[PDB]
Write a protein that binds this DNA or RNA. Structure first.
Lengths: 127, 119, 50, 51, 151, 102, 50, 26, 168, 144, 98, 197
RNA sequence: UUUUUUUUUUUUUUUUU
RNA sequence: UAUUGUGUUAGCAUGGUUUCGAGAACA
RNA sequence: CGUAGCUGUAGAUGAAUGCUAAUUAUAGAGUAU
RNA sequence: UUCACCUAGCCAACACGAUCCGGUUGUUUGGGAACAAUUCCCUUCUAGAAGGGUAAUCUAUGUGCUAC
RNA sequence: UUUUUUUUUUUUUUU
RNA sequence: GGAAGCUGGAAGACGGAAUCGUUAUUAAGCGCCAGGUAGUCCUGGACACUGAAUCC
RNA sequence: UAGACUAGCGUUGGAGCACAUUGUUUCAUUCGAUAGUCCACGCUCAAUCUUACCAUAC
C-alpha cells in the first residue's frame, strides 16, 4: 500500500520514489572512473605508429640467399615485466633464436674482433 | 528380455518436436545440420565457408565422410570408469536441443522454424 | 570416580536449572530474516540502535 | 588453493613466550573499569534541550 | 545515490551485523577484519562491476572477456580477491596479441579440414634410438673425462 | 624404550619439498585458468610447459608422522604405524572410536 | 625471567650428547666442534633463536 | 575393464539408456 | 618408467650449417665471465646445400610436387642420401658459434665471409644506435601506464549504515 | 530380518566421503595434541619461577597497578592479603569466537587460562603398559 | 512485513560421537522444561536419525604379503527434534543450546 | 662398504672461469611469486608460431573441427573501450524496498528456511551451512490462467511438485549467510514483475 | 535497453624492394 | 604460519614396539 | 542387475577377440606404422 | 583391542635408539631396454593404389573347446 | 477393476 | 594408458594320470560400488541373488 | 582320529604383474631358501613428482 497524496505535496520524498534511468547513471560513472584511474587505460601502445619488428632498417638482414649483407638490424625487445627497455641487434629470420641484448655485449665483440681475425687464419685455414 | 530402454523403457537419446510427429536420435542431428548448410548461411546474410564440401550427400557415405561425423559425436554415454553409482551420465539432449533450435534448421517433415524440444 | 562424576553433581542441583532457560538470544535468529525483506534501517544490537 | 595448504603440522617457532614481565602487567590491567556508555552519553544532556 | 561518488547507484550499501569475529587466543589476536574484508562487511552482497572500466577495442576480444564477468559474479568457489585478479590479468594478455581477424586466417590455412599423407611432419621418431642409451652425444663443451673419445 | 613424541616429526628433506610445491601452485592457480581460456577462445590445442613445475599433480600424499609417500589415506593422513601408535595411546576415544567391532 | 619453549624431541637429544661429553670418549674433531654450538648453551640463554 | 565380464557390462549398461550397441563378439 | 616428453626424440629447426658440437681441437675460451651468457668460441664449419637439377625423371617429378606446392609434404625433402649423395655438394669453411654458459646449448653459427662483412659495416651500424636513443624517452611515458587495475571503491571508507548521514 | 543391527551399512560401503554426514576429525586433533606438550613442559617451570622468591612478590604487582589505572582500586591495608598469584599459561589453539552464550571460551577477554596444579584423571590414558611419548628426558642405559 | 512474521517450527538436530554423551543431552533438555510461565511447557517430539558408521581398511606388520587386516571402526550418533507453535523464542532457543 | 668412496674435486682447470660467479638458474623455491602479465602473453605468441611452422599432431586437427561446428550454430564471439552495466547491479537499481518494519513488501504467504550451526568452538568452519530457500503454494496465490502457466514455465517442472502443488526457490551463490539471504529477496520480486504481463 | 581517455610497414615471429 | 644433516656398514647369534611360522591354557 | 520365463533365427563341425593408416575421453605433455 | 606366554622361524629404506664411518650430506636441466624392409611403383594429384620379423626358461590370475 | 490395468525382483529410511 | 568401428586362416577339442582343499545360506556361477585426493589392472578389501550332493 | 575316501569343479595353450638366464655408463637397495613376514616388498596403483640410481653443474 502506497499513498500518492503525500509524495505529490513534498519534493524531498519525490526524489526517492523517482528512479533515474541507467543511462543517466552510466554517464556519471565514466567521468568518475577516468578521474581515479588517470594513469591507466592504455596497454598496447607499440601499435603501427612504429611498426613492430623493426622500422629503421628492414629487408635483407640475415636471409642467407646471396653473398654479403646490405644493412644492419636494430629494434627494441619487451622485457618479461613490461617496464624495462633495452635495444636489440640480433635478427636471424623472424624467430630470432639468438639475441645479442643491449650494447653491453656488442662492445665486447669489437674488442675481441681482431683477436679472432688473427686466430682463424692459423686455426684451420692452412691445415 | 533384452529390450532397449530397460524395465522403465528409458529413452535418453531422442528429441521430440512440437510441430508434426517425428523424432530422431542425436546421431542423425549432426548429418541434418551439415546437409542443410545453405539455408543456415543465407539466413545470417574463405574462413567462414569452410564446411562447404561436407554438404555433399555422397561424400558423407565415403570413408572420409564417416570419420568426420564420428569426430564431432563424442559418444557422451561413454565416460570415465570411476563414474559409478550416483555419478551416472544424464540425458545430453539439453545441449543438443539449444543448438538445434538456435540454428533455425528446417524439419524434414514440414519446413518450419525452431520447433524442437526435449523428449 | 568422584572426579569423573563432577558434571552430574551440577546437573542434579535445582538451583542451576532455573537459569538454564534465561540467556541472550543468538545473533543468528532474526538477522537472516531482516535481510530477506531488504531493509537497511534496523540494527540487531540494542546499544547501537539507541 | 586453500585445500592443499591444509596438510602437515603447523609451525612451532612462533609460540607465546612465558615471560614474567608480561604476567604482572596482565594482572594489573585485569581490574580496569568499563566507562564506555557509548549509548547512554548520547541520550544524556539531550532531554533538557527539548524542554 | 550520493552516498559514494565512485559507485553511482540506487542500492549498494546494506547494514552491518553483530556477529562476533576474531580468534579467542592465538598469535593473531589483534587482527580483526582485513582491509578488503571491511568493505564487504557494510554491503548487502559483493559484486563484480568495479573491474569493468576498460575493455579491449577489438569486438571479438571485448565479448570474450565481458561474458566471463557475468558468470564469475554468479559462481560459488571463487574468492572475492581472486575474482578481481582473474579478470584484471585477462584484459592485459588479450591486448598483447594480434587481432582475431588475422589469427583465424592463419589457423584456417595451416589446418585444412582433411588431412594428408605427410602432414604429421614426424618421421623416424623411434624411442630406442636417440634418447634410450647408446652412450653417445654429450651436450657439453668443457669435458675433462671424455667418455665419447675414451671408448 | 620410548615411543616417539607424535606431535613433532623428525627432519626430512623430501617431506619439506612436497609442501614447497603447494605454496607455488596456490599463487599460480589464477594463471592456470588464463592459459586454458586463451587457447579455448582461439580454438587451438597447445602445451603449457610452465605448469610442469607449478602443477597441481606434482604434489602427492605423504605421511605427517613419517616421510614415506605411500600408504597414506585422506581420512587419517597417517601410515600403518602412525595410526597404530595414535590409537593405542588413548587419543581417539573422544572422537568416537570403539575398537570392539571388527 | 624468560623461558622459551622447545621441541620435546630436542630435550632428550640434548642430554644424550651432554651426558657423554665429559663422561665418555667422543671420537672425531668435527663432532666436538659442531656439537659445542647447539647443546652447550640453554635454549633460553641463547643469543639468537630460529 | 580388461576381462569379458567388466567390459561387457559397459555395453549392456548403455543398452538400458536408450542406445543400441552391436553386442556380438566380446 | 617411460620418458617425460617425446619432443626430444625429434629433429628441431634446421641450423642451415651443420657443425659437430663435440670439439676435438678447440682452443681455450677467453673473457665472457661477468655476463655469464653466450660464450664465444671458434670451431670448424661445414656448409651443405641441395640443388634439384641433376635428379632423374622418376624422382624429380615427385620431389618438385612436394617442395613447390601449397603445403609442405614429408618436410619437403627426400629421405637419407642413399642414392642422391652424388648430386650433394658441400664445401668446408671454418666458422664459429656461441653457447650458453650454464645450459651449454648451441644458438647459431656464422660463415667466415659474413664475419668480415660485419667489420666493414662497423661505421654504418654504430650510427644506427643513436636513432634508437631518440625514441627512448617517447616510449617511456606510453609504456608506463600498461597496467590495468580495478577502480578503488574504499576512499578511506565511511561507516554509512544510516547514521552517519548528517555528518556528510 | 535384523534392521537395527545393520544400521549404517549403506553409508559405510556405498557412500562418498564428500557426500555423507560424516565430518573430519584430523583437523581438531592437529591443534589439540600439540597443546598438551606445551602445558606439560611449561607447567612445572612456571610454578617454580613464581615460588622462587616467596617474600616481596606483591611489591611488583602493586607498583604496576599505579601506571595502568593510576589509582589502586584493589588497595588494602597492611593487615589484609592483596592477592594470590595463580600459574597460568597462554592459549595456542586458534579457536573461533562463536556466538554461543553457553560456551566456556567464547566469552574469553584475555589470553591466559588457569592450569590445574594436580589431576587425578589423566586424559592420555594408555590401553596397556605402553608409556606416553616424549616423557623421558634422561636418556636410557643398558647393562653392557 | 517483519512484525507479521512468526516462528512456525524449529527443527533441532544433534550429532554426538558417544552413547553416554547423547544420553546426557536428553536428561539436560528435560530438566530445562516444566519451569516456564505457561501451564504446559513446550514438549518437542522425538525423531531418531539412525547411526552412521565408517571403517577404513589397511594392510597388516609391514613386509607382509597381505595375510591379515586391521580395521578401525568409527561409529556416530544422531538425534532430531521437532517444534510447533513456538510462541516463546527465549524459553526454547536458550533451553536447546543449554 | 658401499656408497662411501669419495671423489676429489676435479673442477680446477683455468678454462672453467665461468663457474661459481652467478646465481644458479631459477629454483622451485623462488617460484612462489606470481608470473607478471607481460610474460604470460609472450608465451602465447611463441607457441602459436611453432605449431603453424609444421609441428602438427594427429589429435590437433580434431580439436579445430569441433570449434568450427559451434560457429555455424551461432555460439561464438566472432563478429563479421566500453562501460557496460553488470546484471547484478541492474537489479539493485530497480528494487522497491520497504520504508520501515510495519510495511508489508509482499502480498502472499511465504516461508523462509535456513540452517544455523551451533556447538562448541570449532577450529574450522563447517561448510554447507549457508542455504536459503523460499516456498509458496500456487493454489493460494490468486492469478489469471495465462499468468499461472508462465510461473511454472520459467522455473520449470523441477522446482514444482505435482502432488501438493508448491514451488520452492533456492538460491545459494555466496559463502556468507547474510549475503545469500538478501540475494533471494531481490530475485523473488523481479520474478513477479515479469510474470504479470 | 544501450555503444570513444592517446597511436606511421605485406614485412601479423615465411620471402631476393 | 616449513626448519637442527646422513633412504649408510650392523637385527635369526646382544634390541624397544609390531608380527609371520610351531606348541600350550583342565580341579 | 545378471543367468529370467516367454519367443524368432543355423537341432553352430565355422564363434578362439590378439594383430592394426586411426579415431573416442582425462591430463601441461601419452607422440611416430 | 587373550596389553598375556616360549621362541635356533623378522625390517638398520615408517620412526627412535648403543658403536664405526662423514659423499658443498642439497639443487637446475635429462635419461631409466624387450615392436626397422626409408613417403616401396615414367600406372597420379586440390574427389585415396601395390612393402613393415626378438621364434630362450618358471610362479600366481582373469577368458575359451563339449551334440555327427 | 464388465469405461480397472496393460505388468519381473536388490544391498539405509514412512521414527 | 582405457574403450570402440572395420578387417579376421596365431597354432586350442590334449586328458579321465596327477598336485593344490571345502567343518552347508559352506562349494559352484552370475551382477554392483567404496577408497586409492586428473586418467590408471585380471590382485586385495566389501555387499546382494540362483544355489546341488556325500560314508566326513 | 583331521590328512585318506565319497560329490562339484578350476590346469600341460594364447594373454596382465612379478622373481630369474641373456643386454646395461642407470635398468630399484631388497625378503625367504622345501608348505611361505618369496612373485602388486614398507608397488592401497611407477605416463614428469613419488625415485633412493646415472649423466651433467652451482
Amino acid at each position: 500500500e502506497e499513498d500518492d497524496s503525500v509524495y505529490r505535496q513534498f519534493a524531498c520524498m519525490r526524489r526517492v520514489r523517482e528512479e533515474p534511468r541507467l543511462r543517466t547513471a552510466l554517464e556519471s560513472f565514466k567521468v568518475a572512473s577516468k578521474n581515479a584511474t588517470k594513469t591507466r587505460g592504455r596497454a598496447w601502445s607499440v601499435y603501427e605508429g612504429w611498426p613492430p619488428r623493426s622500422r629503421v632498417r628492414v629487408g635483407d638482414e640475415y636471409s642467407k640467399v646471396g653473398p654479403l649483407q646490405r644493412r644492419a638490424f636494430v629494434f627494441n625487445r619487451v622485457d618479461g615485466t613490461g617496464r624495462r627497455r633495452e635495444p636489440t641487434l640480433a635478427f636471424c629470420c623472424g624467430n630470432k633464436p639468438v639475441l645479442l641484448l643491449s650494447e653491453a655485449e656488442f662492445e665486447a665483440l669489437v674488442k675481441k674482433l681482431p683477436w679472432i681475425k688473427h686466430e682463424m687464419a692459423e686455426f684451420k685455414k692452412l691445415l | 528380455a533384452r529390450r532397449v530402454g530397460g524395465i522403465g523403457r528409458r529413452c535418453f537419446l531422442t528429441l521430440h518436436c512440437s510441430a508434426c510427429s517425428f523424432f530422431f536420435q542425436t546421431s542423425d542431428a549432426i548429418k541434418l545440420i551439415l546437409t542443410q548448410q545453405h539455408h543456415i548461411l543465407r539466413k545470417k546474410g574463405a574462413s567462414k565457408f569452410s564446411l562447404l564440401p561436407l554438404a555433399d550427400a555422397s561424400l558423407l557415405l565415403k570413408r572420409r565422410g564417416a570419420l568426420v561425423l564420428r569426430s564431432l559425436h563424442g559418444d557422451p554415454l561413454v565416460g570415465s570408469r570411476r563414474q559409478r553409482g550416483e555419478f551416472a551420465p544424464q540425458a545430453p539432449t539439453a545441449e543438443m536441443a539449444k543448438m538445434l533450435n538456435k540454428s533455425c534448421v528446417p524439419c524434414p517433415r514440414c519446413k518450419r522454424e525452431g520447433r524442437w524440444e526435449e523428449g | 570416580l568422584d572426579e569423573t562424576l563432577t558434571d552430574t553433581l551440577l546437573d542434579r542441583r535445582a538451583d542451576l536449572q532455573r537459569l538454564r532457560s534465561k540467556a541472550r538470544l543468538p545473533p543468528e535468529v532474526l538477522e537472516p530474516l531482516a535481510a530477506f525483506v531488504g531493509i537497511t534501517r534496523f540494527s540487531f544490537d540494542r546499544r547501537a540502535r539507541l | 588453493g586453500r585445500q592443499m595448504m591444509k596438510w602437515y603440522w603447523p609451525s612451532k617457532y612462533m609460540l607465546q613466550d612465558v615471560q614474567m614481565a608480561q604476567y604482572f602487567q596482565m594482572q594489573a590491567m585485569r581490574f580496569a573499569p568499563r566507562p564506555a556508555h557509548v549509548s547512554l552519553t548520547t541520550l544524556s544532556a539531550t532531554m533538557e534541550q527539548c524542554w | 545515490d550520493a552516498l559514494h561518488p565512485h559507485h553511482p547507484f540506487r542500492n549498494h550499501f546494506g547494514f552491518e551485523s553483530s556477529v562476533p569475529y576474531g580468534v579467542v587466543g592465538s598469535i593473531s589476536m589483534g587482527k580483526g577484519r582485513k582491509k578488503i574484508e571491511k568493505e564487504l562487511a557494510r554491503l548487502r552482497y559483493p559484486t563484480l562491476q568495479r573491474v569493468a572500466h576498460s575493455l579491449p577495442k577489438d569486438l571479438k576480444y571485448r565479448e570474450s572477456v565481458a561474458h566471463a564477468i557475468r558468470v564469475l559474479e554468479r559462481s560459488r568457489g571463487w574468492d572475492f580477491e581472486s575474482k578481481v585478479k582473474a579478470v584484471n590479468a585477462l584484459v592485459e594478455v588479450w591486448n598483447r596479441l594480434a587481432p582475431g581477424r588475422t589469427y583465424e586466417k592463419i589457423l584456417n590455412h595451416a589446418f585444412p579440414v582433411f588431412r594428408g599423407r605427410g602432414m604429421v611432419k614426424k618421421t623416424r621418431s623411434r624411442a630406442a634410438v636417440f634418447n634410450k642409451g647408446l652412450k653417445y652425444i654429450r651436450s657439453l663443451t668443457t669435458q675433462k673425462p671424455l667418455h665419447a673419445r675414451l671408448q | 624404550l620410548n615411543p616417539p613424541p607424535i606431535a613433532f616429526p623428525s627432519f626430512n628433506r623430501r617431506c619439506q619439498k612436497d609442501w614447497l610445491a603447494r605454496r607455488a601452485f596456490a599463487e599460480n592457480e589464477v594463471n592456470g585458468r588464463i592459459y586454458k581460456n586463451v587457447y579455448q577462445n582461439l580454438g587451438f590445442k597447445g602445451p603449457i610447459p610452465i605448469l610442469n613445475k607449478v602443477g597441481q599433480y606434482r604434489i602427492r600424499m605423504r605421511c605427517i608422522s613419517g616421510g614415506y609417500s605411500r600408504g597414506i589415506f585422506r581420512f587419517t593422513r597417517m601410515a600403518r604405524m602412525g595410526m597404530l601408535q595414535l590409537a593405542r595411546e588413548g587419543w581417539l576415544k573422544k572422537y568416537g572410536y570403539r575398537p570392539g567391532l571388527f | 625471567a624468560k623461558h622459551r619453549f622447545f621441541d620435546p624431541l630436542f630435550r632428550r637429544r640434548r642430554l644424550s650428547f651432554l651426558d657423554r661429553f665429559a663422561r665418555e670418549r667422543i671420537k672425531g674433531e668435527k663432532a666436538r666442534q659442531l656439537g659445542a654450538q647447539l647443546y652447550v648453551k640453554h635454549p633460553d640463554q641463547k643469543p639468537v633463536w630460529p | 575393464c580388461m576381462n569379458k565380464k567388466n567390459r561387457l557390462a559397459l555395453r549392456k549398461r548403455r543398452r538400458r539408456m536408450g542406445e543400441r550397441v552391436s553386442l556380438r563378439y566380446r | 618408467t617411460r620418458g617425460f616428453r617425446w619432443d626430444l626424440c625429434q629433429r628441431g629447426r634446421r641450423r642451415w650449417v651443420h657443425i659437430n658440437y663435440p670439439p676435438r681441437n678447440r682452443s681455450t675460451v677467453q673473457m665472457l665471465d661477468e655476463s655469464h651468457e653466450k660464450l664465444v668460441f671458434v670451431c670448424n664449419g661445414y656448409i651443405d646445400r641441395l640443388d634439384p637439377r641433376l635428379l632423374p625423371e622418376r624422382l624429380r617429378k615427385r620431389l618438385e610436387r612436394n617442395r613447390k606446392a601449397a603445403l609442405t609434404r614429408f618436410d619437403g625433402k627426400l629421405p637419407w642420401g642413399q642414392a642422391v649423395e652424388s648430386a650433394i655438394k658441400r664445401i668446408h669453411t671454418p666458422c664459429l658459434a656461441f653457447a650458453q654458459a650454464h645450459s651449454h646449448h648451441l644458438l647459431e653459427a656464422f660463415s667466415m665471409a659474413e664475419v668480415l662483412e660485419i667489420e666493414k659495416l662497423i661505421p654504418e651500424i654504430r650510427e644506427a644506435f643513436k636513432a634508437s636513443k631518440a625514441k627512448l624517452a617517447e616510449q617511456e611515458a606510453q609504456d608506463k601506464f600498461t597496467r590495468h587495475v580495478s577502480v578503488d571503491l574504499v576512499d578511506l571508507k565511511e561507516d554509512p549504515v544510516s547514521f552517519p548521514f548528517t555528518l556528510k | 530380518a535384523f534392521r537395527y543391527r545393520r544400521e549404517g551399512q549403506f553409508t559405510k560401503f556405498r557412500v562418498h566421503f564428500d557426500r555423507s554426514g560424516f565430518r573430519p576429525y584430523i583437523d581438531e586433533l592437529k591443534w589439540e595434541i600439540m597443546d598438551w606438550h606445551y602445558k606439560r613442559a611449561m607447567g612445572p617451570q612456571m610454578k617454580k619461577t613464581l615460588m622462587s622468591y616467596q617474600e616481596g612478590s606483591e611489591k611488583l604487582q602493586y607498583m604496576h597497578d599505579l601506571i595502568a589505572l593510576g589509582t589502586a582500586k584493589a588497595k588494602f591495608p597492611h593487615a589484609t592479603k592483596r592477592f594470590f598469584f595463580v600459574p597460568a599459561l597462554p592459549v595456542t589453539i586458534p579457536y573461533r569466537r562463536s556466538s554461543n552464550p553457553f560456551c566456556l571460551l567464547s566469552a574469553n577477554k584475555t589470553g591466559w587460562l588457569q592450569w590445574s596444579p594436580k589431576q587425578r584423571v589423566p586424559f592420555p590414558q594408555p590401553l596397556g603398559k605402553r608409556k606416553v611419548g616424549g616423557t623421558d628426558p634422561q636418556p636410557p642405559v643398558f647393562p653392557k | 512485513a517483519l512484525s507479521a512474521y512468526s516462528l512456525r517450527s524449529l527443527i533441532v538436530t544433534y550429532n554426538s560421537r558417544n552413547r553416554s554423551s547423547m544420553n546426557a543431552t536428553i536428561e539436560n533438555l528435560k530438566n530445562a522444561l516444566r519451569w516456564t510461565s505457561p501451564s504446559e511447557s513446550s514438549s518437542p517430539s522425538s525423531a531418531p536419525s539412525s547411526a552412521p558408521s565408517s571403517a577404513p581398511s589397511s594392510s597388516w606388520s609391514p613386509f607382509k604379503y597381505k595375510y591379515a587386516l586391521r580395521h578401525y571402526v568409527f561409529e556416530d550418533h544422531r538425534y532430531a527434534f521437532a517444534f510447533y507453535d513456538v510462541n516463546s523464542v527465549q524459553e526454547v532457543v536458550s533451553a536447546a543450546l543449554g | 662398504k658401499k656408497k662411501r668412496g669419495k671423489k676429489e674435486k676435479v673442477i680446477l682447470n683455468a678454462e672453467q672461469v665461468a663457474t661459481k660467479t652467478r646465481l644458479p638458474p631459477i629454483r622451485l623455491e623462488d617460484r612462489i611469486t606470481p608470473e607478471p602479465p607481460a610474460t604470460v602473453a609472450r608465451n602465447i605468441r611463441s607457441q602459436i608460431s611453432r605449431a603453424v611452422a609444421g609441428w602438427k599432431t594427429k589429435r590437433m586437427f580434431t580439436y579445430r573441427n569441433k570449434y568450427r561446428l559451434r560457429r555455424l550454430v551461432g555460439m561464438t564471439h566472432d563478429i563479421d573501450g566500453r562501460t557496460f552495466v553488470t546484471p547484478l547491479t541492474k537489479l539493485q537499481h530497480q528494487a522497491a524496498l520497504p520504508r520501515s518494519p510495519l510495511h508489508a513488501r509482499f502480498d502472499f504467504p511465504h516461508t523462509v528456511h535456513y540452517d544455523v550451526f551451533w556447538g562448541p568452538p570449532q577450529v574450522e568452519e563447517e561448510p554447507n551451512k549457508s542455504g536459503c530457500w523460499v516456498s509458496f503454494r500456487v493454489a493460494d496465490l490468486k492469478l489469471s490462467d495465462s499468468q499461472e502457466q508462465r510461473l511454472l514455465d520459467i522455473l520449470g517442472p523441477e522446482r514444482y511438485d505435482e502432488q501438493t502443488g508448491v514451488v520452492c526457490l533456492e538460491a545459494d551463490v555466496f559463502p556468507q549467510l547474510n549475503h545469500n539471504a538478501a540475494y533471494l529477496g531481490d530475485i523473488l520480486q523481479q520474478l513477479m514483475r515479469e510474470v504479470k504481463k
